[PDB]
Amino acid sequence: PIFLNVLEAIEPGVVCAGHDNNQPDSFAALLSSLNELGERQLVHVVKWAKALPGFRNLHVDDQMAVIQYSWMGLMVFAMGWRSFTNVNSRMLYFAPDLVFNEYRMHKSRMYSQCVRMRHLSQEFGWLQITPQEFLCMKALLLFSIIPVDGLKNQKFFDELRMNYIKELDRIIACKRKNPTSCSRRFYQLTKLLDSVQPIARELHQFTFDLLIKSHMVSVDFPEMMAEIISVQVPKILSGKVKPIYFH
Numbered sequence: 001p002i003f004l005n006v007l008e009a010i011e012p013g014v015v016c017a018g019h020d021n022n023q024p025d026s027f028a029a030l031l032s033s034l035n036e037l038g039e040r041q042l043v044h045v046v047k048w049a050k051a052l053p054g055f056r057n058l059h060v061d062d063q064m065a066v067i068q069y070s071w072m073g074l075m076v077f078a079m080g081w082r083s084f085t086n087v088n089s090r091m092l093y094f095a096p097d098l099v100f101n102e103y104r105m106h107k108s109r110m111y112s113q114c115v116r117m118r119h120l121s122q123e124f125g126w127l128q129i130t131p132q133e134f135l136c137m138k139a140l141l142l143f144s145i146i147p148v149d150g151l152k153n154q155k156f157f158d159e160l161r162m163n164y165i166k167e168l169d170r171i172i173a174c175k176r177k178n179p180t181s182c183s184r185r186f187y188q189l190t191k192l193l194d195s196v197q198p199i200a201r202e203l204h205q206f207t208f209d210l211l212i213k214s215h216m217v218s219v220d221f222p223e224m225m226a227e228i229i230s231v232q233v234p235k236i237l238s239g240k241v242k243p244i245y246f247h
């Protein structure tokens with residue numbers, strides 16, 4: 001299983017937020033830690049993406065763009081998996097040192113989004129998503145958001161995305177002789193993948209609004225994140241960059 005061996009091999013390890021859990025919870029501290037954790041994960045998402053089969057085929061400018069557009073969604077999906085495996089969806093496992101209970105979900109002012117991610121977390125269990133399906137679905141997520149005006153080399157991207165879908169087909173067919181069974185599974189997985197997008201959108205909107213008023217609530221945005229929120233996120237929010245839904 002060359003393809004799956006690679007996905008397993010490059011899967012990022014544990015990333016901590018550096019949050020002070022000995023301090024009473026506050027909006028400013030919780031968000032600063034989410035921001036810092038976001039940036040720490042981006043470092044790994046970039047290394048992960050660049051090590052993915054065929055990613056180098058993409059034009060250099062498209063590589064960066066795709067990573068930045070998919071950043072939020074990729075983190076959402078992996079976070080939901082961690083919440084399921086580590087705490088059976090009882091809380092949201094953003095990081096070992098940044099676990100959200102309902103109180104934190106509320107204090108962060110991201111309650112609706114957190115609840116949707118908890119539901120996603122539960123879905124991993126309800127649908128009995130295997131670790132290999134998770135890995136392949138997450139890679140596919142990276143190739144699920146593009147600009148209307150197109151990428152520099154759209155054809156290369158279309159080929160790569162198609163190949164990742166084919167790998168998902170193979171993983172689904174592995175140990176499934178009945179085509180009907182494969183079809184139902186593909187339906188379930190693509191429906192689950194689609195559900196990630198609306199969640200990332202709510203987080204993008206929240207993050208955008210927060211940055212614009214950051215100086216009013218004492219929230220610290222890392223240099224890199226601020227740039228991406230001000231340059232890339234608005235393209236998504238204004239409809240210039242859109243997710244590719246299956247349904």
Ligand SMILES: C[C@](O)(COc1ccc([N+](=O)[O-])cc1)C(O)Nc1ccc(C#N)c(C(F)(F)F)c1
Nearest residue numbers: 034035037038071072075076079094207228233
């Ligand atoms: C509020 C914020 O810190 C904003 O972080 C951003 C994350 C991504 C972008 N972006 O443009 O792709 C912008 C901002 C945040 O949502 N941070 C995090 C940090 C870690 C994780 C994880 N795991 C998550 C997520 F995805 F679970 F919501 C969110």
